[PDB]
Design a protein around this ligand. Sequence first.
Ligand SMILES: [Zn+2]
Ligand SMILES: [Zn+2]
Length: 56
Amino acid sequence: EEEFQFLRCQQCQAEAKCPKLLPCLHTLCSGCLEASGMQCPICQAPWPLGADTPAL
Ligand SMILES: [Zn+2]
Ligand SMILES: [Zn+2]
């Protein structure tokens, strides 16, 4: 309902490219997303560390 709201990518949405944790909508795509336009505070940091997400 909040934060978590995607599972593909910021711009290149094909098949979840960001395995980053999923509590802060960070399942976008490690390469073009960084709280720049998906719903996160300049996250760009804990990308490699994720909690309960799908990953790739
Ligand atoms: Zn992308
Ligand atoms: Zn985030």
